[PDB]
Amino acid sequence: GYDRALSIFSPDGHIFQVEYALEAVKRGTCAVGVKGKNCVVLGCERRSTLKLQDTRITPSKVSKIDSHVVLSFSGLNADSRILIEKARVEAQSHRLTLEDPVTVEYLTRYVAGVQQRYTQSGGVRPFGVSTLIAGFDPRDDEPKLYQTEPSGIYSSWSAQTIGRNSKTVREFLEKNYDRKEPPATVEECVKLTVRSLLEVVQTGAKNIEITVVKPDSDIVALSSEEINQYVTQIEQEKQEQ
Amino acid sequence: SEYDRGVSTFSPEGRLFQVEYSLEAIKLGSTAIGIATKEGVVLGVEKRATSPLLESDSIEKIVEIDRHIGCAMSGLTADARSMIEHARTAAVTHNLYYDEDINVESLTQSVCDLALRFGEGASGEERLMSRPFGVALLIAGHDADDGYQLFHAEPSGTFYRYNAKAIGSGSEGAQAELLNEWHSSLTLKEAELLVLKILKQVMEEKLDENNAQLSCITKQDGFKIYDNEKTAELIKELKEKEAAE
Amino acid sequence: PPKRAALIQNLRDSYTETSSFAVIEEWAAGTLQEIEGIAKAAAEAHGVIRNSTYGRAQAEKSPEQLLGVLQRYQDLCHNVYCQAETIRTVIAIRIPEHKEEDNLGVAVQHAVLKIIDELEIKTLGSGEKSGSGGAPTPIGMYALREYLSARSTVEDKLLGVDAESGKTKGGGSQSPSLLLELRQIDADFMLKVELATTHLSTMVRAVINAYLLNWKKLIQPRTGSDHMVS
Amino acid sequence: PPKRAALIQNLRDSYTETSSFAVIEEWAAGTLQEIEGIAKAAAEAHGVIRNSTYGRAQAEKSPEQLLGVLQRYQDLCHNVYCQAETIRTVIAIRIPEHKEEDNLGVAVQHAVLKIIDELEIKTLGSGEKSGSGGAPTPIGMYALREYLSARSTVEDKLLGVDAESGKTKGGGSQSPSLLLELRQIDADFMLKVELATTHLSTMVRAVINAYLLNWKKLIQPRTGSDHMVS
Amino acid sequence: PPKRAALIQNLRDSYTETSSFAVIEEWAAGTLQEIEGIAKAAAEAHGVIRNSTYGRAQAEKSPEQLLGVLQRYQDLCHNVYCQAETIRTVIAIRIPEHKEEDNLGVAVQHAVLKIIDELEIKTLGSGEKSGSGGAPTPIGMYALREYLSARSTVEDKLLGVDAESGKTKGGGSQSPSLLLELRQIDADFMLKVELATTHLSTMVRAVINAYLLNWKKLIQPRTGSDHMVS
Amino acid sequence: PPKRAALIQNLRDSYTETSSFAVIEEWAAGTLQEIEGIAKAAAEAHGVIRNSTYGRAQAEKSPEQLLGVLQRYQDLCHNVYCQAETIRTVIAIRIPEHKEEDNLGVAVQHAVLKIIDELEIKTLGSGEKSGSGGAPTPIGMYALREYLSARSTVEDKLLGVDAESGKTKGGGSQSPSLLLELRQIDADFMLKVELATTHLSTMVRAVINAYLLNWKKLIQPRTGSDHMVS
Amino acid sequence: TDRYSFSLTTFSPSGKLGQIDYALTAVKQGVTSLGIKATNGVVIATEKKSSSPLAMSETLSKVSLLTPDIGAVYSGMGPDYRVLVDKSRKVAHTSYKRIYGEYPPTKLLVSEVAKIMQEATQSGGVRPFGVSLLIAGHDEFNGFSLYQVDPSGSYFPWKATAIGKGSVAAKTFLEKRWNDELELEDAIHIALLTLKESVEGEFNGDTIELAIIGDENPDLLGYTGIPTDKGPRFRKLTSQEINDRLEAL
Amino acid sequence: SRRYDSRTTIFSPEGRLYQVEYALESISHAGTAIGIMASDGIVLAAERKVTSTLLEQDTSTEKLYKLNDKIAVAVAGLTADAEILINTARIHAQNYLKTYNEDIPVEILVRRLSDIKQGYTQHGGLRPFGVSFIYAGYDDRYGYQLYTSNPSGNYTGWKAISVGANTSAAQTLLQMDYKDDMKVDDAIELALKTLSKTTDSSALTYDRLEFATIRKGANDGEVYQKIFKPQEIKDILVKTGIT
């Protein structure tokens, strides 16, 4: 077989080791990014299955990279922590050498840069992470949303999802998200993000994290009640028809 | 069966299969087409997106190297970003040292002297990177010495100059057609409808100005990447001539 | 190649996954209870022969009750072997282009195909001309044929040969053992149906599990996805 | 070597890809329906024998309807085996120079050739002298021959046979089981045609798929392309 | 797939680990003592025949004591073979999705399954048609059948009687060795039961150990645990 | 699992190392001298037949001296095969949890087990239905059976029919060679006991050495010792 | 054989590094050696075996001085021990004496040595040491000590124990005749009667190499004038001192 | 045959890292250790695995260690692999103190360590740490905290956790009786009231234990960290359910 190393091409021009890394992203929990036209909203799910543990300092899956940029992932947990750190430092080094704080693409590019660097030489293993980077460039108002894969490629999207059962959530989004006219309200843009996870969450808002980011370094996480205030209003019109 | 696992292993008949497979990686990319005319050079590509939520321009399949040189790639994207980057630095540096523009082929040259850096072991010097790049390039440019030139870069390390060429999944049928169309006295507008026509042909999906990107370069304005409205009507204006004959 | 695409399409539309899944449901309920039925049908039929005394009278007729079981069995094997060929036809036509890579699914296909053929071999039975593995398989689905052929040979040594003139006779064999053997041939072929069906239960239950788990890979051996190349 | 080039050329012009593709189309429509036809032809023929009572009368004549099926079957096997040899001839003559490299296509050729031979083995059937795998293959295409030979041996035991002064009889037979066996030999060889054809459907449907997918590599095992050397 | 999940569930609920463990307990006590019993039952029966003189009288009847052993044996094999199929059914339905990784447990399953089949082969015995390994297996569970068939052939040569003149004399074929052979056929088939049972003890004791050790892996071939990914 | 631990415990207490070591001691002294005894017992018995002239008289009785040897031999094989099954039972129940590591001892177990089975095959002998290796094994432990069957067939040819020992109405064949063959059948089966026992000596001596060396590993296949982890 | 026992970097499915255990086998083979902790001393001993009497065994030590308060012995691959020793006597200066103006306590040397033992492991391209040592010494704040060090890098403290071929039982003997009180002379005794059964050769003064940690020897310095510099506690008994204690059993 | 478990640098077709999983498997071979959170303290309880009649154990330790003057950890797994970490874990802890002139926060220290363990999982020529850790400590940021980390490099915060042998059992029992506020002397209770049930030995003997706790209050405006002595144990052990 030819799937044994990163430095070998299969007869048909593939490199399976990198491909298999992706098969791990599917293992992790689901993440979903949805942008409006004055905001961007990220959503996740909580692996609430085996708990008798703490609560205070529980990861939110979503992390801030700079005052104006947040990042979310899916896949090998431990692997993810390093990318988040490396991107945080770079974000500060950019300000140190150019005054100006980073752009959402420059960050995405730097990250994917790393992910690709770990598929070059052998005696190295590709990060088993896939990530969604959202935010707003400095003194700019156009919402941005990018995604990166373990292979090293990055891309922008109007809305996108990764992780287990991302095929489903994606179908949904596709027939709902209007390219010509994005959610014009942070409230509805949330509503749309919530209702999408509400097809893989397995009931309860106790399994859903939502973070909202607007222009001017204005970011803010969501609470358990607020989140349920939507599970509520969407469980209405659900049987309402 | 046994000699295709080492990038530094000759098969009994003097062949380097890993390099060959490398190329086979490109066929998987979507088609890219280049046609040269005494008026300028044209570059067109099939975008091919998995979803309607992707942002098109997100897929940079055609890019600028410098004001007088552009190009379209096919194959592994991560591997492309690295060449595009080297190429751009190559151009700019030369500018700095000479206060002039790098000859298209001399640029193409440096791009190949880069792929030429594969191989791990240690028999003397040192060139860190295990295998061949999985991608090819269509470099369209122009310089005062040899005018509008069009090149094909292969991970093998060599390159040829073309009058018109196509790479990617469709380079099979596309290259045939181009063999029976191209002629030295083609106008720029003529080549545009030709690149546009051959894609539609050996492409697949209904050819819309979303899954097809088109660009060109000229002495006058350098590298410009045709906006959507232009390409859009260039498609209508195209698909029309098909009615009569 | 627009026509070549057609042929392959019609093929897979004739035998969809629904066709083979139906076969599994049948085996889940109907077909399994039937085997368990034929199991005790020949179980009590074997108990009867054990509590009987054989005389010349039983060599002058073939026990209709036994012919009822070996027949009811041959019938079941017939059905299974056909329902199997259905599942096999569903897979065989979905074996992808022969490659030297991406055969993770193909392996699953070949694996299940093998277990199915092992099932078809049991039902089809041994026969009388053999496969290097011998005849460790209980009794074929040609039990009826082999049975009558076995008993027939003994009914001739027993009921006899009598040529005439009225002054001398021939025989209606003496060996006391030859008479008991006619009794055993009825007892054994009834035991062979118990076992053959006990094992056939196991086999069927196995194939059901094996199918219900790998079915996704059986239909979709390869999942195209070129996200790297572009 | 301009003449040696000629011979090889004429060879491949006599058996082009069109020749073998035609064979696949035939199997797609005509040949498959025919097998499905012979399937039920012997299916109802087996139902008839199940609802009949055999007497000395049926041992004095060979059931022509059965001979009609076993014959119609032998005919189909004949054709297939020849249409297969056509496809094989198309490939065998396109096996490239023996090398130790670039055998990705060659592998495909050998692979398909193997599945085809597995098909030819089924149709050709078992026989009566045997390959290490035994005779797990239903019934050969010499069913007619084996059938008459099986029934014939039993028709000599039921009927008897004579010569003259003393008594016409001569050979010939109680055993109630020997009479039922004449009934089974007619029933079995009808079942053997059901199965043999059911499996033969599957096999044919498989080879069709296998061919339609790898055909490009079958004709062009190696694709010369020296872009590096110059 | 909520229904497909159901089928697989009901399957494993019908044959739990408790079902197979019960089988092992039975073999631990009951079934083993029984084999050791049948061991000496035919041991002393072999000693008797060794101290006897055979005459024409013993060719006119089948020794009921021996038929008592070969029968009591055939009964035990029957049971074991069924109790084994139980253990096999418990595993076969718990063989996971076919993968190319994480088969450490699967290996254990296949391993034990093999030792079990090796057991079933011994009990099922040799037969009269066979497997490439021959018949190195003592005597099948069809001893009764083979025995009567062996003795029967000799009771015809030895036996064929009539009366003449005042004092009495007799008229079967002569060979003094043919008479001793009737004596050996009774002695051998009694020895074959000693051995067959001695080895059958060993085999059973082995399977018990083999099961009691790997049972955890037999039920839980794979232990899901994604602690890294999240 | 406190009960599951019990079962496995009682098993290994029933068959300890002492049980198998006793078997080796017996083979060291008693059993070996006995084989060397049976060796010359048939050696001189073969010399006698070489210096004798056979007539019709020797076809009317079976040489009791020879039956004394083939019997004394069958007795020895019986014992050995049982004493072996003892040693095997001692190991089989001590085969550890199936792992993919630490099988250095397990290998030794399987190795010795194989040599033992090779021994059991010799003693059990060839038989009359055969294992792919044929019958290169001298003579089974069923010599008595095969012998009487061989001589018996010839005592019928030489020995006439209607009638009774003498000059008679009842003759036989004149073939001078058929008479010498009756002489050879007595000579050969005596030679087959010489060889069978010569080789059987070697085999036994081997197993003794093989056991006395690896016995530690046979009982303790794995030696737990976690000094690193803590 | 596994397919996991030929790589220091490899975990078997259960979780056992391999090459280590086989290394630990070369040790469970070496010549028998023991160590007993007293209340006012500690004794470490190991046997000697001659290739031939044509060789001078009195030019190859087996009980070594690391610090004038610590000595050590071994069982396993001869050659390793010889250098593992000189690397220990150095990592004893460069890592402590040269930073604190004094020699190191028992515990820390044993750990500075297990540290060098550790390296051999974590890293493909080298093999671990085929030796296991018993290190015995004493330092002011800890009283006397006894420690074992294996290729695995781990190390533990005993009261008494043995390593080598004849250890299963020797380690059984000791277990029986040990109690918190034994004065050093007792230990020196209990040792010989255990170094007794563990031999097939002889029992003279040469084929036995034993040393012990005890009281200070104000003679074994070489100078006198400085009050605190009192003397070395490590004493390797001479061929004579021995066989005398052998007569009185 | 052919398997994807030959090293750490290799993903199986399904994105599994076997080599790492096997290391995670080496833990179930270690002595049980427990950690229980409390409204006023944290308890660390372990059960020495290794054993023999002549094995010094009243002086030296094997499972409980002080990293910081306010942080403690329970070990489980490869002895040597444990020290290598423990030491660096101590150096890092002191650099924070030396730079910020403040004591290092618990999560930061646990994260730094998990981040090293992570790394030995991604680079060739390296073998992951066959260790697991139960961190118990206190900082002014989040009061008392209980954390756990495995060889894969992930960490997490429990209210009561167990690692080692029979984790299923130990874990289960706790999940049952743990009262969310439970005072300290009830946790030290529950410590044995769990370790007991999941042992083997005819009897749970003191010389086979290791306890330590972290308490603080208004009194010493700071934290007192105690590592029980063989004595206190043999005693508090009787006060419960041992003769």
Q: Where are the beta strands (DSSP E) in chain C?
A: 161-162, 170-171
* Rg of the Cα atoms in chain F: 25
Interatomic CA distance for residues C208 and C83, integer angstroms: 12
A224 close contact with B: CB closer than 8 A: no
End-to-end CA distance of chain A: 54
- H helix runs in C125-175, sequence order: 143-159
- Of B62, B21, B5, nearest in space to B213 by CA: B62
Residue E198 to residues D90, E41, E143, G1, Cα–Cα distance (Å)? 61, 12, 16, 33
Interatomic CA distance for residues H220 and H70, integer angstroms: 13
Q: Kindly determine whether residue D230 and residue B13, on different chains, have CB atoms separated by under 8 Å.
A: no
Is E193 within 8 Å of E143 (Cβ atoms)?
A: yes
Q: Kindly determine whether residue H31 and residue F228, on different chains, have CB atoms separated by under 8 Å.
A: no
3-class SS letters over B34-83:
EEEECCEEEEEEECCCCCCCECCCCCCCEEEEECCEEEEEEEEHHHHHHH
A173 close contact with B: CB closer than 8 A: yes
- Of F223, H49, H164, nearest in space to G156 by CA: H49
Classify F84 as helix, strand or coil: helix
What angle is formed at CA E13 by the lines to CA E8 and CA E15, rounded to 5 degrees? 105
- Of F88, F18, F57, F46, nearest in space to F165 by CA: F57
Residue C2 to residues B204, C9, D204, Cα–Cα distance (Å)? 14, 11, 21
Interatomic CA distance for residues C166 and C162, integer angstroms: 11
- Of G117, G149, G126, G132, nearest in space to G8 by CA: G126
> Which residue of A lies nearest to E226 if distances are taken between CA atoms?
A27
Chain breaks in chain D (C to N over 2.5 A) after: none
Is B164 within 8 Å of B56 (Cβ atoms)?
A: no
Q: Kindly determine whether residue A2 and residue C100, on different chains, have CB atoms separated by under 8 Å.
A: yes
Interatomic CA distance for residues F209 and F211, integer angstroms: 5
Please, what is the angle between helix F143-157 and helix F176-219, to 10°? 170
DSSP G179-214: -TT--HHHHHHHHHTHHHHS-SS--SSSSEEEEEE-
3-class SS letters over chain D:
CHHHHHHHHHHHHHCCHHHHHHHHHHHHHHHHHHHHHHHHHHHHHHHHHHCCCCCHHHHCCCCHHHHHHHHHHHHHHHHHHHHHHHHHHHHHCCCCCCCCCCCHHHHHHHHHHHHHHHHHHHHHCCCCCCCCCCCCCCCCCCHHHHHHHHHHHHHHHHHCCCCCCCCCCCCCCCCHHHHHHHHHHHHHHHHHHHHHHHHHHHHHHHHHHHHHHHHHHHHCCCCCCCCCCC
C57 close contact with B: CB closer than 8 A: no
- Of F166, F218, F187, nearest in space to F49 by CA: F187
What angle is formed at CA D86 by the lines to CA D82 and CA D91, rounded to 5 degrees? 145
- Of C155, C185, C201, nearest in space to C66 by CA: C185
Give the CATH number of domain H1-243: 3.60.20.10
Interatomic CA distance for residues G200 and E19, integer angstroms: 57
- Of D158, G249, F163, B190, nearest in space to C148 by CA: D158
Is A82 within 8 Å of H118 (Cβ atoms)?
A: yes
* Rg of the Cα atoms in chain B: 19
Q: What is the DSSP letter of B28?
A: G
Provide the sign of the torsion angle of the four alpha carbons D118, D122, D127, D131, taken in this order: positive
C7 close contact with B: CB closer than 8 A: no
Q: Kindly determine whether residue C228 and residue B29, on different chains, have CB atoms separated by under 8 Å.
A: no
Is G137 within 8 Å of G233 (Cβ atoms)?
A: yes
How many CA atoms lie less than 13 Å away from D201 in the CB half-sphere? 26
What angle is formed at CA E77 by the lines to CA E73 and CA E83, rounded to 5 degrees? 145
Residues in chain D: 230
* Rg of the Cα atoms in chain G: 19
Q: What is the DSSP letter of A102?
A: P
Residue H43 to residues D216, H39, H74, H191, H232, Cα–Cα distance (Å)? 72, 11, 10, 8, 15
Contacts of B162 (CB under 8 A, 6+ apart): B34, B36, B150, B151, B152
DSSP E25-48: HHHHTHHHHHHHHHHHHHHHHHHH
CATH T-level assignment (fold) for domain C1-220: Four Helix Bundle (Hemerythrin (Met), subunit A) (1.20.120)
* Rg of the Cα atoms in chain E: 25
Q: Which two tokens stand for residue H9?
A: 């640098």
Residue G70: enclosing H or E segment and its boundaries?
strand G70-76
The CA-based diameter of chain A, rounded to the nearest angstrom, is 57
Strand partners, H111: none
Q: H154 to chain A: which residues are within 8 Å by CB?
A: 77-78
Q: Which residue, chain included where needed, has tokens 């609560």?
A: A55
Residues in chain B: 245
Q: What is the DSSP letter of B146?
A: T
Q: What is the DSSP letter of B119?
A: -
- Of A138, A200, A170, A162, nearest in space to A80 by CA: A162
Is H181 within 8 Å of A78 (Cβ atoms)?
A: no
Break chain H into its structural domains and give their ranges: 1-243
Q: Which residue, chain included where needed, has tokens 């508090």?
A: H236
Residues in chain H: 243
Q: Which residue, chain included where needed, has tokens 């990250």?
A: A111
Chains E, H: CB contacts under 8 A, how many? 31
Interatomic CA distance for residues E121 and A69, integer angstroms: 70
H194 close contact with A: CB closer than 8 A: no
Is H191 within 8 Å of H43 (Cβ atoms)?
A: yes
Interatomic CA distance for residues B196 and B192, integer angstroms: 6
Is B217 within 8 Å of B40 (Cβ atoms)?
A: yes
Interatomic CA distance for residues H158 and C78, integer angstroms: 61
Q: What are phi and psi of A156, to 5 degrees?
A: -100, 150
Residue G138: enclosing H or E segment and its boundaries?
strand G131-139
Interatomic CA distance for residues A21 and A27, integer angstroms: 10
Interatomic CA distance for residues B29 and B213, integer angstroms: 14
Q: Which two tokens stand for residue G72?
A: 């050590």
Contacts of E171 (CB under 8 A, 6+ apart): E160, E161, E162, F162
Q: What is the DSSP letter of G103?
A: P
- Of B73, B170, B148, nearest in space to B115 by CA: B73
Interatomic CA distance for residues F21 and B93, integer angstroms: 87
Q: What is the DSSP letter of A229?
A: H
Q: What are phi and psi of H57, to 5 degrees?
A: -150, 0
Strand partners, C170: C162
Q: Nearest CA to CA, how far is F110 from chain G (Å)?
A: 13
Residue G131: enclosing H or E segment and its boundaries?
strand G131-139
Classify C210 as helix, strand or coil: helix
* Rg of the Cα atoms in chain D: 25
Q: For B146-165, b where at least 16 C-beta lie within 10 A, e where not — what string?
A: eebbbbbbbbbbebeebebb
DSSP chain E: -HHHHHHHHHHHHHS-HHHHHHHHHHHHTHHHHHHHHHHHHHHHHHHHHHT----GGGGSS--HHHHHHHHHHHHHHHHHHHHHHHHHHHHHTT-----SS--HHHHHHHHHHHHHHHHHHHHH---SS--TT-S-SS--S-HHHHHHHHHHHHHHHS------SSS----S---HHHHHHHHHHHHHHHHHHHHHHHHHHHHHHHHHHHHHHHHHHHH-S-----SSB-
A178 close contact with H: CB closer than 8 A: no
Classify G45 as helix, strand or coil: strand
Residues in chain A: 241
Interatomic CA distance for residues E213 and F5, integer angstroms: 9
In chain A the domains, ranked by start, together with CATH numbers, are 1-241 (3.60.20.10)
The approach used to solve this structure was X-ray
Q: B77 to chain C: which residues are within 8 Å by CB?
A: 228-230
Cα dihedral E175, E177, E179, E185 in deg (nearest 10): -140
Give the pairing type, strands B62-66 and B40-46: unpaired
Q: Where are the beta strands (DSSP E) in B79-120?
A: none
The residue type found at G69 is: D
Classify C30 as helix, strand or coil: helix
Interatomic CA distance for residues G209 and G203, integer angstroms: 11
Interatomic CA distance for residues H122 and H48, integer angstroms: 32
Residues in chain G: 249
Q: B50 to chain C: which residues are within 8 Å by CB?
A: 227
Asked whether F and E share 3 or more beta-carbon pairs under 8 angstroms, the answer is: yes
Interatomic CA distance for residues F141 and F121, integer angstroms: 10
H115 close contact with A: CB closer than 8 A: yes
Q: What are phi and psi of B29, to 5 degrees?
A: -70, 170
Chain breaks in chain A (C to N over 2.5 A) after: none
- Of D160, D80, D170, nearest in space to D121 by CA: D80
Q: Kindly determine whether residue G124 and residue H125, on different chains, have CB atoms separated by under 8 Å.
A: yes
Interatomic CA distance for residues B171 and B194, integer angstroms: 15
Cα dihedral H9, H12, H14, H19 in deg (nearest 10): -70
Q: What are phi and psi of A205, to 5 degrees?
A: -100, 5
- Of H8, H9, H31, H33, nearest in space to H21 by CA: H8
End-to-end CA distance of chain D: 25
Interatomic CA distance for residues G147 and G168, integer angstroms: 18
> Which residue of C lies nearest to D24 if distances are taken between CA atoms?
C7
CATH T-level assignment (fold) for domain B1-245: Glutamine Phosphoribosylpyrophosphate, subunit 1, domain 1 (3.60.20)
DSSP C53-87: ---GGGGSS--HHHHHHHHHHHHHHHHHHHHHHHH
Break chain C into its structural domains and give their ranges: 1-220
Is A33 within 8 Å of A147 (Cβ atoms)?
A: yes
Interatomic CA distance for residues H5 and H12, integer angstroms: 8
Contacts of D165 (CB under 8 A, 6+ apart): none
Q: Which residue, chain included where needed, has tokens 């019928």?
A: F156
3-class SS letters over chain H:
CCCCCCCCCCCCCCCCCHHHHHHHHHHHHCCCEEEEECCCEEEEEECCCCCCCCCCCCCCCCCEEEEECCEEEEEEECHHHHHHHHHHHHHHHHHHHHHHCCCCCHHHHHHHHHHHHHHCCCECCCCCCCEEEEEEEEECCCEEEEEEECCCCCEEEECEEEECCCHHHHHHHHHHHCCCCCCHHHHHHHHHHHHCCCCCCCCCCHHHCEEEEEEECCCCCCEEEEECCHHHHHHHCHHHHCC
Give the pairing type, strands A144-148 and A129-135: antiparallel
Count of H-run helices and E-run strands, chain A? 6, 10
Please, what is the angle between helix F2-14 and helix E176-219, to 10°? 150
Interatomic CA distance for residues E91 and B192, integer angstroms: 67
Classify G130 as helix, strand or coil: coil
Q: Which domain holds residue G123?
A: 1-249
Q: What is the resolution of this structure in A?
A: 3.2
Chains that touch C (3 or more CB pairs under 8 A): A, B, D, E
What angle is formed at CA A99 by the lines to CA A98 and CA A102, rounded to 5 degrees? 75
